[PDB]
């Protein structure tokens, strides 16, 4: 988990 990962919707299923 990275709190600063930039993807906003990509990583949501």
């Amino acid at each position, epitope marked *: *988990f*990275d709190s*600063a*990962e*930039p*993807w*906003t*919707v*990509r*990583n*949501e*299923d």
Partner: antibody
Amino acid sequence: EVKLVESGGGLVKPGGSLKLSCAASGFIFSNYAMSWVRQTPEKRLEWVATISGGGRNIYSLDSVKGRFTFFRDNARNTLYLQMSSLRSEDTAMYFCSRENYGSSFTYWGQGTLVTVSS
Amino acid sequence: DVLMTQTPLSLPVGLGDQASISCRSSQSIVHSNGNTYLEWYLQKPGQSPKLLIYKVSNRFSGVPDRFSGSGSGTDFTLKISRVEAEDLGVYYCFQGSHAPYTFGGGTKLEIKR
């Protein structure tokens, strides 16, 4: 509906600076992360950076850190790429692309060409 | 860094026939959230790349069922069940799991007239 249009590409001397823009329409811009992807003259694709919807979280190529700045103006539906200390390796077609649920580069623009040359 | 090894470099195929394009990653590309962000793009002549497949095997909206993706861990394959002239261009695999994100070198599909 969804439209992405890059601009600002052109000729710049090695060590020079250039600002690229990406204009977006047809969706709620700040709801989506945006990426910059470049295509080299040998036609390889290279991911350059990804920036969050709100514009404060960024992943980028280590080779462009300290040289390129990524940011967006969500009030104007525009993504920016501020290039400085340009190198010959930066010569490429630059594409902007919007993410979507489950996929990284869902919509692409037409690209803008950057030539780094004396 | 994750190297993506994509083969063949080009592929001549008759109209109506099948093609398989392979992609291997130099290490596992399972994202921290358990998903595998392996994607396939097609760049047609004179166009930008467009999304075909995401999360290894999911077809993007509008993409014909002729295209299917498979694989896991480090080995992935794009399969085209029967080729049409509109399928001409360069296919690229991409991993979005581990930064810096990386593309395969591409496969040029050609029609065997």
